[PDB]
Ligand binder design. Structure first.
Ligand SMILES: NC(=O)c1ccc[n+]([C@@H]2O[C@H](COP(=O)([O-])OP(=O)(O)OC[C@H]3O[C@@H](n4cnc5c(N)ncnc54)[C@H](O)[C@@H]3O)[C@@H](O)[C@H]2O)c1
Lengths: 250, 254
């Protein structure tokens, strides 16, 4: 994957790990960088545009928890303008096990919904060009932080969903892979307050900076491997192998 | 685990797997067996009672998609009556990838919510007695039926959640294990929808391969309950009961 002159939609582009990935992406001479986030950060947005003014950066206020139909309405406006979109990056997410419904709505349901929305524009069965989906999941989708069981479970779901998307690529023309960051250089809520110090404890352990998580993120996008399950931990980029415990035979 | 004299709540006890599990459960001399299901089934209820009149069987009309406060209200009613509950079984699920929100609400969120509610009565930090939770997940939580990605993902979520619950037992006093059937002959798999109709023949193709009976599944389910192994990930496929080992890809070190 050569990112030059490509059109990219990035959901939650101006947050923590999103912003540093975004900074590197706009340095790659994209034609369009389309940002969809819940709230505007005008300082960050201006800063992004200044990195390379030639890149068309557009911002849409977007809540990932809206129904599929609402996401399709926004996407139609984007496709009407750009004509083509090459990659969708899903980076929405919250970490707060005091918010059970919302954790699920944002991290899991929202990810499924926006994917379903864009498939209506990309599905090759209906004359669509196909496309690429990069889902920001989490290493907690492989093995949980058991003190944030709801967060971890939501990430396990999207690791699964991404895996299946990739296996459906021959039918849909839409490839996908997951980007799974380890702990990246603040305090949050554990489920039923089983551990009030999760953030303090995790951030003391060996971590990585948001800078070369973002650099490894772009490397992963460039590698463009359907069905990859990328681990981005301790400043390295590694593809993990999913264990086969069971087979549907279909 | 001796089931004699125990109090059991079973969410979704009257479906294909549920009813056959229930038939086996009441073979043991349970004290109270409390059924929560979405639709009343007076014939099945009568049948179970007849199996073992020593077991006290009650029924509540219950939808897992209600807010947690509502589930808490029902549990309080039950705990006030029985004083103690020994085991909770969370068995609700739908298979319909035309229903994204509902699949996730029933299969994942609803399971998390009943668990969260019952912890209020059981949590040893509150001076509760602890307890045991058996969660019906799915082999699809290990490896998807990719033509139903949403269902499979919802099951992956609950496998994860159950693993974590079990790891929290030393703190909460509440142990847990997953029950993961393979393809089992019930109405669930008779006819169903794939995501965006990627595979309109999915039910046909799946059932062209070997399956097990709900009877076999229910027998092995109760066997796993009696084994009572915290953190177990039980596979119930082709008539066998087998514990699987979850691969370690990453460790939080906490
Ligand atoms: N049949 C299989 O091959 C298979 C394989 C693996 C896992 N499972 C799982 O086993 C469980 C039982 O499935 P089944 O095969 O007996 O299917 P079923 O359709 O016969 O029964 C589903 C059960 O879930 C209940 N339910 C559905 N929605 C509910 C709601 N909103 N609130 C409360 N209860 C609700 C139903 O009333 C019923 O008791 C499900 O969780 C399913 O995902 C089934």
């Amino acid at each position: 994957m050569d990112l030059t002159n490509k059109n990219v939609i990035f959901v939650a582009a101006l947050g923590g790990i999103g912003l540093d990935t975004s900074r590197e992406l706009v340095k790659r001479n994209l034609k369009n960088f389309v940002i969809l986030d819940r709230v505007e950060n005008p300082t960050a947005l201006a800063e992004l545009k200044a990195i390379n003014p030639k890149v068309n950066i557009t911002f849409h206020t977007y809540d990932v928890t809206v129904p599929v139909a609402e996401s399709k309405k926004l996407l139609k406006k984007i496709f009407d303008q750009l004509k083509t979109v090459d990659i969708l990056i899903n980076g929405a997410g919250i970490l707060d096990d005091h918010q059970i419904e919302r954790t699920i709505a944002i991290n899991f349901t929202g990810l499924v919904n926006v994917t379903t929305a864009i498939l209506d524009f990309w599905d090759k069965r209906k004359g669509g060009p196909g496309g690429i989906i990069a889902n920001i999941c989490s290493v907690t989708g492989f093995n949980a932080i058991h003190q944030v069981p709801v967060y971890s479970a939501s990430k396990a779901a999207v690791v699964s969903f991404t895996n299946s998307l990739a296996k459906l690529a021959p039918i849909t023309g839409v490839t996908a892979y997951s980007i799974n960051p380890g702990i990246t250089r603040h305090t949050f809520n554990s489920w039923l307050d089983v551990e009030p110090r999760v953030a303090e404890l995790l951030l003391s352990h060996p971590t990585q900076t948001s800078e070369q998580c973002g650099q490894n993120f772009v490397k992963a996008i460039e590698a463009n491997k359907n069905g990859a399950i990328w681990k981005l931990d301790l400043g390295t980029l590694e593809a993990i192998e999913w264990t086969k415990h069971w087979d549907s035979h279909i």
